[PDB]
Symmetry: C2
Subunit: 89 residues, 2 copies
């Protein structure tokens, strides 16, 4: 898909995030994308340890938003942080 | 606005969130909305104490997502949690 970016592009974004969260988070999931003009949008869930302070999890959020914006010109990300009970499977 | 919901509706959503976060968060900001068919979308920032564990902040996120979905049929929310340094002004 509908308003999603091309599946190929979503998977490039996924692979990029997966490399960037190594040792810093448990997983990224529920990637949802779309394009509007000069802009692309990504929202996803970043799964971390439940006892991770918001301030710490958020530092990683800022790092990721900047990394994504640079690696995918036009793309801006909104990140929803979750505890380990939200992990896939 | 552009793809935003009507300003009137955004403000109703804002007032609803502001009541719901009393004593539980510092503020909600950067409300961004849009409608696609039977669906409406909201993303916002929920500002809490930096030392708030992700697991705690996320419990409030689930409460808010459910409250919004019930009070605004069709609406689904993505919440980005932030520490106190992200507060307005
Ligand atoms: Zn999601
Ligand atoms: Zn999730
Ligand atoms: Zn836990
Ligand atoms: Zn969640
Ligand atoms: Zn925002
Ligand atoms: Zn913010
Ligand atoms: Zn602080
Ligand atoms: Zn942020």
């Amino acid at each position: 898909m509908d308003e999603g970016l091309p599946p190929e592009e979503v998977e490039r974004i996924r692979a990029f995030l997966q490399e960037r969260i190594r040792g810093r988070a448990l997983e990224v999931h529920d990637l949802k994308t779309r394009r509007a003009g000069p802009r692309s949008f990504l929202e996803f869930h970043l799964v971390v340890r439940g006892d991770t302070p918001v301030e710490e999890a958020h530092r990683l959020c800022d790092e990721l938003e900047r990394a994504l914006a640079q690696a995918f010109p036009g793309l801006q990300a909104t990140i929803h942080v979750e505890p380990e009970g939200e992990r896939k499977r």
